[PDB]
Design an enzyme around this catalytic site. Sequence first.
Site, PDB file in Angstrom:
ATOM      1  CE  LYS A  86       3.345   3.584   8.135  1.00  0.00           C
ATOM      2  NZ  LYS A  86       4.662   4.243   8.367  1.00  0.00           N
ATOM      3  CD  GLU A 108      -2.663  -5.102  11.631  1.00  0.00           C
ATOM      4  OE1 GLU A 108      -1.606  -4.637  11.098  1.00  0.00           O
ATOM      5  OE2 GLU A 108      -3.365  -6.035  11.135  1.00  0.00           O
ATOM      6  CB  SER A 376      10.477   7.330   4.971  1.00  0.00           C
ATOM      7  OG  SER A 376      10.922   7.479   6.275  1.00  0.00           O
TER       8      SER A 376
HETATM    9  C1  LIG Z   1       5.800   3.681   8.596  1.00  0.00           C
HETATM   10  C2  LIG Z   1       7.025   4.467   8.395  1.00  0.00           C
HETATM   11  C3  LIG Z   1       8.314   3.899   8.288  1.00  0.00           C
HETATM   12  C4  LIG Z   1       8.623   2.438   8.508  1.00  0.00           C
HETATM   13  O1  LIG Z   1       7.911   1.490   7.672  1.00  0.00           O
HETATM   14  P1  LIG Z   1       8.621   0.849   6.402  1.00  0.00           P
HETATM   15  O2  LIG Z   1       7.558  -0.164   5.974  1.00  0.00           O
HETATM   16  O3  LIG Z   1       9.916   0.193   6.869  1.00  0.00           O
HETATM   17  O4  LIG Z   1       8.894   1.884   5.368  1.00  0.00           O
HETATM   18  C5  LIG Z   1       9.372   4.727   8.058  1.00  0.00           C
HETATM   19  N1  LIG Z   1       9.259   6.066   7.945  1.00  0.00           N
HETATM   20  C6  LIG Z   1       8.066   6.640   8.043  1.00  0.00           C
HETATM   21  C7  LIG Z   1       7.985   8.126   7.895  1.00  0.00           C
HETATM   22  C8  LIG Z   1       6.913   5.865   8.275  1.00  0.00           C
HETATM   23  O5  LIG Z   1       5.714   6.506   8.366  1.00  0.00           O
END
Ligand SMILES: *Cc1c(COP(=O)(O)O)cnc(C)c1O
Lengths: 395, 395, 253, 253
Positions: A86, A108, A376
């Site tokens: 993010k 938000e 992610s």
């Molecule tokens: C926020 C988040 C997601 C999901 O959001 P996407 O916009 O689909 O990428 C996935 N994995 C992690 C670690 C997150 O913090």
Amino acid sequence: TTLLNPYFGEFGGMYVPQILMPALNQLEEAFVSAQKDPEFQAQFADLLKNYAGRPTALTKCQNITAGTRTTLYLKREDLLHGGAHKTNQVLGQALLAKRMGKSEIIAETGAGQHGVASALASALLGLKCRIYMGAKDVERQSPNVFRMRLMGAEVIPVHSGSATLTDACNEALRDWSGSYETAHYMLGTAAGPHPYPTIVREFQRMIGEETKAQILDKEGRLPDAVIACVGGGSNAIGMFADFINDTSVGLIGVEPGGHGIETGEHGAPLKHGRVGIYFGMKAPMMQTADGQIEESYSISAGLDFPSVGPQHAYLNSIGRADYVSITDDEALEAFKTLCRHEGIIPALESSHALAHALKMMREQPEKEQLLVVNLSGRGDKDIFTVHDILKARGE
Amino acid sequence: TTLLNPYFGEFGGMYVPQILMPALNQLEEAFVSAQKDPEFQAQFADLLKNYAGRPTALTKCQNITAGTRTTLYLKREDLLHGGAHKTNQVLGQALLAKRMGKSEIIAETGAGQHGVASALASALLGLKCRIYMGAKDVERQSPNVFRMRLMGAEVIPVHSGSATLTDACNEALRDWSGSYETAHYMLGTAAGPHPYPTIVREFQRMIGEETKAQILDKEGRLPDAVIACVGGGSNAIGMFADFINDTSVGLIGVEPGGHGIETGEHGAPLKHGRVGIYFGMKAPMMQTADGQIEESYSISAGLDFPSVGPQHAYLNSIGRADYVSITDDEALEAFKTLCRHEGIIPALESSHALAHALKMMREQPEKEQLLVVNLSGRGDKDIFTVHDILKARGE
Amino acid sequence: MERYENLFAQLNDRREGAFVPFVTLGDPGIEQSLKIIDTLIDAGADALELGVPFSDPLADGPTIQNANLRAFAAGVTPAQCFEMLALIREKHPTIPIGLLMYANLVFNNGIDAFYARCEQVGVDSVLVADVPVEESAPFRQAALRHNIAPIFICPPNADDDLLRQVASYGRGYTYLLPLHHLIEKLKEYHAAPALQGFGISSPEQVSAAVRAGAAGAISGSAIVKIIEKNLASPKQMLAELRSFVSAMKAASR
Amino acid sequence: MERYENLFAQLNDRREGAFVPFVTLGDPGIEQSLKIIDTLIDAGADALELGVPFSDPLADGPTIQNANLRAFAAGVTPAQCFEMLALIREKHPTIPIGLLMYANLVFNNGIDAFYARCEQVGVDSVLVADVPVEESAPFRQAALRHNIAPIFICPPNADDDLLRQVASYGRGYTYLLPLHHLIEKLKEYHAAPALQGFGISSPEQVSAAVRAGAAGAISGSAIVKIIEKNLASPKQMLAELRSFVSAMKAASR
Ligand SMILES: *Cc1c(COP(=O)(O)O)cnc(C)c1O
Ligand SMILES: *Cc1c(COP(=O)(O)O)cnc(C)c1O
Ligand SMILES: [Cl-]
Ligand SMILES: [Cl-]
Ligand SMILES: [Cl-]
Ligand SMILES: [Cl-]
Ligand SMILES: [Cl-]
Ligand SMILES: [Cl-]
Ligand SMILES: [Cl-]
Ligand SMILES: [Cl-]
Ligand SMILES: [Cl-]
Ligand SMILES: [Cl-]
Ligand SMILES: [Cl-]
Ligand SMILES: [Cl-]
Ligand SMILES: [Cl-]
Ligand SMILES: [Cl-]
Ligand SMILES: [Cl-]
Ligand SMILES: [Cl-]
Ligand SMILES: [Cl-]
Ligand SMILES: [Cl-]
Ligand SMILES: [Cl-]
Ligand SMILES: [Cl-]
Ligand SMILES: [Cl-]
Ligand SMILES: [Cl-]
Ligand SMILES: [Cs+]
Ligand SMILES: [Cs+]
Ligand SMILES: [Cs+]
Ligand SMILES: [Cs+]
Ligand SMILES: [Cs+]
Ligand SMILES: [Cs+]
């Protein structure tokens, strides 16, 4: 009129009240300009490298795939500053806010993850950050609330309506509709009205661009498939974007199956919802028969939403990308497996991508395949959740 | 007889029972051999890069130093996999264990941070990891205990003696004295008997080597001073080692001052203790008049120990490095300052290094100085501690 | 849309402005809502704007979000709202009825079918809160095929291109949020008659709107506030609604 | 160290081995410890090994760690231990007294001063648990200057270089943890007489040590276990200590 196409096929658009259209048009113009500006690109590259830590590692699993013909790499967005991908796009949007002459950020948050990302970008860049959060959410999210406040953001409890995320979002947009001269609304995924799906993809695309270069260097070829979890769509579209034109590379997005699709307690609108219009976009969403938006469910808060960004719906429709689901229990097993066998604690969001890759391996263990999972985020935040579940069922 | 000098001046040595000397001699031989082996170096570089994420960013502060003549960079060990610099050397020692034909790791832990680092290296490399921990510690450290168990390590509660860290360490060493043919003892700092102070420095020295290259690239010169917190000494000696022969560069180590040196509740033996012999080494330690080891205190568990590694005592004695202290309250202010002004949540350990750099800046704000702080770790783990303190005093 | 044309003609013959209250259908329950609506008309409302409760409105202020949740939590559904609308139309032959809708509820079972149902129950206009003129083509086409006026908002931040589009595409009335110049340009471009809807909560704002040459005024939330304030006393709720609407309409004359 | 030379000569004249119990000084308090020690001697202990409580011992098993904590928690200090030692020596002119020390307590106020205090109170040997022969030079030098035997451990994992060093540097006895060959090599190299100290907890292990040609045996923790088992009854504690030591010494003869 817009400079860029607001649609991906039939999906996307700008379904906002008229009052917000100048704000969206302003942002589109600034983005188009920024994308042609070498100095903007250099400033963004500098933050990504020197502050956030890019490039992120590409880690080859070995223990996890032993005795199969799967080679599995993890793209280590868990190592980015902030603990998840993010960070990449909030830095870019913060620079766009400054480009438009703004010194205030509006966001938000529900569970608080996007709020923390917004707050950290704003702190670094000296921007005044206000984050709307439903009162019910503030009470349940003391750690993230505290982190945002430590970073100097003002967290503004919202008591109207149901005092949760939709109400916070409404208030953030009401604010923005009056303040957009001085304040930028920092949308936290590849969804909502144009131009956000486009901006978020372009500000996440280094995930796939790095992955491509790293895989070529290590393996001398492109991957057979890249696999990403899908909450709103940002990490997945950032992993996919640079491979869209490499038509041999599979693009697999993993939605949360929750308790099981058949239970209706899931967050998988792309394959198990219905096109609708909400949050600024025409996109798949989980809906009641009479067109109310259904509540989603996942063990993982970051995936727990009833819609998805429009570029995924489009890539699905044309068959360029394939979308699957993984249940809470599958994600939990993947979480345990990575901790034990690779010494990495993955976010439960990411664990859904990993679970699908483990399934591709285990179902067909003599199939030769080169897979990349978009890891992610890291999973420190999830250890109590996992503990509680394992204890409850006696592990 | 040894291959390398076990002493730094008068400090260091191998003050262990005779039964452990073959184990230390074996490890010294394997380390000397490994350091000459390009294939060992290549395997270690591969783990550091592709698994841990090196190189780590060097971040230029701007908001923090505005309106002064201090330029401050943070060496971002907080971005390493595992959240702190400890990962670097556990990977190296795990490879040394394999080099000696061992498939088992022994460690001990008190608050659990070194235990987690040991467990993650062992999980990645497929080593069987047993971690001794005093029963009193196990009960207070459920999160770290759970993380170690998720990573497949066996956490072995120790009920003998006072059922805390010394007892755990005793049991770990008793084990090792019988099992050293098959098991390696993974010491968690640049302390204890030779060859550990040497090994830990060499397996942490990429911190300073990277810092040197990054500073030259960005500033075209060496730093005026590099500043690091000192628990046992590993991040600080890893930051310092590559600059020891650059005699213009100041090496500043920051010990925890706790409630204030004058209170005796601190962990600053180098400047406020007395040479003694314990844990395998002749080194400064906090002592009673009759030679018992005193309890140390710091807000930060990672610094809270009554001794320090011998190479620091030596560098101090000859005047090559200077050692200072920072109190709990100074460290807390630095923690708050970095969160608010840079969007980075630092470990409270690292916050002691940052606090000293802020003091160098604020005391003499027209002094031109180029400073690097070794940001040893991230501070997610410390948010409850900080919350509780701020609340207690009404902030 | 003919009800609006007839209404404005009649008001023009009386040199009067229109006064148009908004309420959420089914707030605070279906029975009380029907009484509220009859009271608004009896007290002199010239037309109505009526909202259909939606799970996730992203374009309404706190007062309205609160009312949405009262109706929605009381189990009011779009099908029930359409039953209500048919009943309202059956009681009041000439009063223009406008809906304020979120796009999903219009798109759900087909845009065309939605407007066909509006026409069947006797609705005269639809404002879709989250469809800007740039995205309006399928909505306004379905509206016009079913004799429904598509209402558009002309916001504070409007430019000339927007004025021309709203003027060209809207029917029934223009929902208006310098002021006398917006009204002048809308007339120049043959727009639907303007109703000022920005923060209309007192008689002097109604007379100001008339004096500015607007066709009248819309009270976007003052009626809802009165409901919210009087939940514990339905009788008093009707009395205060009647007084407020009577005062507001008197200001138009 | 002359007490050991005299003891071994006398035991040799009787073709007997030595039996040497270890206890922690001040475990479980000073008064009871003094009684324990007198009981050990009266029951036939040939010499004593006595520990001084230390805050952070890293070289003792659980039984000993437990005893360390009983004494240490009861506030026994090194100064009090040295008062005890003077009293023990005053009661028992010929019994060799050996200390088991951690390096810090020896180094604290100066290594030489530590051994000088040992000599003043009548101690005969010191084993420093965490000083290997490689680091022993200042300790053994101070010991010999003050007529104290430096004791070294010959571990299971010993090589020839270690045997030669221990043989050369030690006095009083060699603390021994194939076996008959270690004993043979130590004699060849003129080492101090060997006491087997590996897990000596029963009479048959004492006779085995003698049969192997060792000078005797050290009970590193069996005496401490008896203390630990009988804490609630001091009288029974002494009775069981007396029986155990009597049995062990009988096995040496
Ligand atoms: C926020 C988040 C997601 C999901 O959001 P996407 O916009 O689909 O990428 C996935 N994995 C992690 C670690 C997150 O913090
Ligand atoms: C463990 C730790 C330290 C202290 O140990 P050193 O060996 O002195 O480096 C400091 N900072 C962090 C973040 C740690 O985890
Ligand atoms: Cl276009
Ligand atoms: Cl496209
Ligand atoms: Cl289209
Ligand atoms: Cl370039
Ligand atoms: Cl995180
Ligand atoms: Cl600010
Ligand atoms: Cl908290
Ligand atoms: Cl705060
Ligand atoms: Cl607002
Ligand atoms: Cl290229
Ligand atoms: Cl339904
Ligand atoms: Cl040497
Ligand atoms: Cl040196
Ligand atoms: Cl020396
Ligand atoms: Cl090389
Ligand atoms: Cl951590
Ligand atoms: Cl294993
Ligand atoms: Cl837990
Ligand atoms: Cl587990
Ligand atoms: Cl053991
Ligand atoms: Cl070089
Ligand atoms: Cl004292
Ligand atoms: Cs494989
Ligand atoms: Cs989703
Ligand atoms: Cs500066
Ligand atoms: Cs310390
Ligand atoms: Cs018109
Ligand atoms: Cs000798």
